[PDB]
């Protein structure tokens, strides 16, 4: 019943090898919808998503517009950055950002963000409030108080509550035959003998929207969360996702082992045993 | 300098089948920095036209990457993904496990 | 929707 648009910017700088790189996705939940890519021999902001498609070119020069500002300033960032560090031109660095709103059920903002990270570490993030920022050293202290003389908090809020949720609810609503349809996972448990003292249960959830799910294997109702293989939720590619729990099991023990399934696509939780 | 090798994960988009035209996918995450190489193998030989997904990242900062080829699986033709990152020594080779 | 270009790190 919640939903979320976000926003992943990547900056990437390769001394020798040109200008910084930028990169930038939205997704509304767990769907792509577009697309801005720096290297194009044209960059654009480009459709990813049917429901997007329909938006006329005011919309689509606004968002390749602001893009390529964007390149110019990440560029900017990625030096300044370099400097706050005292790290050498030869080197390259990354320089991450995530930002958007959740809404629930009603479509009212539940939570905004807006968090970055350099070289795979946490940076700054505006805090919950929507007002403050935490940074994570000294150096983004100082795009702390650069931001602070700019009020950008007074914007990003500005955003989050407004334009953001605005916007997120038009999409759920072009796009509600997808972004409002859960797809419930495809089962079964397969059996895979490893020896003759034991053998492999595994749980299988196939073709679900969206990608959260919960898959836990029980031995005589007991969660046996120490001994699941997991694998990583995985996309099919169609927009759907796949994922498999995996349990060894001493022969003969098998039909103590019980696969439990829960996903919003489902109208009960799952409960599954391996069928012979 | 933060640097996370990737995971790999190769699979079909549908339960497959010798003889119905499906999709090879070679799913790399949790890797950084964000460059990576990756091709899909028929019988050891690099697959042409394959397409991938626009660059993303989890929660906690790490890429992820779709790779993929429609595909028509047999019995004899072996699949693979062949995977290099600056975390590897040398690119990872990871067989399509049709036994899954 | 993006939000607006904002200041430089
Ligand atoms: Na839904």
């Given at each position: 019943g919640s939903h979320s648009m976000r926003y992943f910017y990547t900056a990437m700088s390769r001394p020798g090898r040109g200008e910084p790189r930028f990169i930038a996705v939205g997704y509304v939940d767990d769907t792509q919808f577009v697309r801005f890519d720096s290297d194009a021999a044209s960059p654009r902001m480009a459709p990813r998503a049917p429901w997007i498609e329909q938006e006329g070119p005011e919309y689509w020069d606004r968002e390749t517009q602001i893009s390529k500002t964007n390149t110019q300033t990440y560029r900017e960032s990625l030096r300044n950055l370099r400097g706050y560090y005292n790290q050498s031109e030869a080197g390259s660095h990354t320089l991450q950002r995530m930002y958007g709103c959740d809404v629930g059920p009603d479509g009212r903002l539940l939570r905004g963000h807006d968090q970055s990270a350099y070289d795979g570490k946490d940076y700054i993030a505006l805090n919950e409030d929507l007002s403050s920022w935490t940074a994570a050293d000294t150096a983004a202290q100082?795009?702390?108080?650069?931001?602070?003389?700019?009020?950008?908090?007074?914007?990003?809020?500005?955003?989050?509550?407004?334009?953001?949720?605005?916007?997120?609810?038009?999409?759920?609503?072009?796009?509600?035959?997808?972004?409002?349809?859960?797809?419930?996972?495809?089962?079964?448990?397969?059996?895979?003998?490893?020896?003759?003292?034991?053998?492999?249960?595994?749980?299988?959830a196939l073709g679900f929207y969206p990608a959260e799910i919960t898959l836990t294997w029980q031995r005589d109702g007991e969660d046996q969360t120490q001994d699941t293989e997991?694998?990583?939720?995985?996309?099919?590619?169609?927009?759907?996702?796949?994922?498999?729990?995996?349990?060894?099991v001493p022969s003969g023990e098998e039909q103590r082992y019980t696969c439990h399934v829960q996903h919003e696509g489902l109208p009960k939780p799952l409960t599954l045993r391996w069928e012979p | 300098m933060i640097q996370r090798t990737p995971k790999i994960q190769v699979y079909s988009r549908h339960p497959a089948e010798n003889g119905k035209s499906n999709f090879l996918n070679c799913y790399v995450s949790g890797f950084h920095p964000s460059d990576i190489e990756v091709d899909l193998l028929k019988n050891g030989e690099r697959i042409e036209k394959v397409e991938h997904s626009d660059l993303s990242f989890s929660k906690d900062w790490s890429f992820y990457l779709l790779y993929y080829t429609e595909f028509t699986p047999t019995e004899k033709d072996e699949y693979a993904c062949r995977v290099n990152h600056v975390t590897l020594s040398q690119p990872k080779i990871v067989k399509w496990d049709r036994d899954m | 929707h993006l939000a607006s270009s904002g200041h430089s790190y």
């Open positions: 100082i795009t702390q108080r650069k931001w602070e003389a700019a009020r950008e908090a007074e914007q990003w809020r500005a955003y989050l509550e407004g334009l953001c949720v605005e916007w997120l609810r038009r999409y759920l609503e072009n796009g509600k035959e997808t972004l409002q349809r859960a797809d419930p996972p495809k089962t079964h448990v397969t059996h895979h003998p490893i020896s003759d003292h034991e053998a492999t249960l595994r749980c299988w997991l694998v990583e939720t995985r996309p099919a590619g169609d927009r759907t996702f796949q994922k498999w729990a995996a349990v060894v | - | -």
